[PDB]
Amino acid sequence: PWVGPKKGSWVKILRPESYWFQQRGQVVNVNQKPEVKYPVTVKFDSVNYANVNTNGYALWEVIEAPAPGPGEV
């Protein structure tokens, strides 16, 4: 039984200290081990100050938002 958002599905970030808070990014993969605290891996078009466009988030920090659309983060 798959857990978390599907691969390639857009999710809105709910981590307040994240550089992409309330932004959206494609789900690269979700780790299926229940022991992993932050299994969801999300990649973004906008890099942060460390020039990193991907990060691993918790299961409770992604809400499966729709596609961004024209001129929308």
Binding site: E17, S18, Y19, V36, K37, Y38, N48, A50, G56, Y57
Partner: protein, 86 residues
């Protein structure tokens, strides 16, 4: 001495350990990430405070955070060479 804390968001990069110039950080086994390892700071008394570990950390916000404490400086945290405090 400063205060170097490691948070759960660590993904076992080992980059923070490699970037530390005074061997403050080390890798310990854990079970909260796919790498089965998290960083630790057992020797922050040798932490000068260069924050290279924070530069090297790739998590969204640093899984390793160095808190500067200037009213706390020791001879090791200041990198004293000409002068000994022991």
């Amino acid at each position: 001495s400063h205060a170097v804390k490691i948070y759960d968001t660590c993904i076992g990069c080992t980059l923070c350990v490699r970037a530390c110039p005074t061997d403050v950080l080390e890798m310990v086994p854990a079970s909260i990430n796919a790498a089965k390892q998290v960083a630790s700071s057992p020797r922050v008394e040798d932490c000068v405070g260069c924050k290279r570990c924070e530069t090297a950390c790739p998590t969204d916000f640093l899984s390793i955070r160095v808190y500067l404490q200037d009213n706390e400086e020791t001879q090791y945290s200041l990198g004293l060479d000409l002068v000994d405090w022991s």
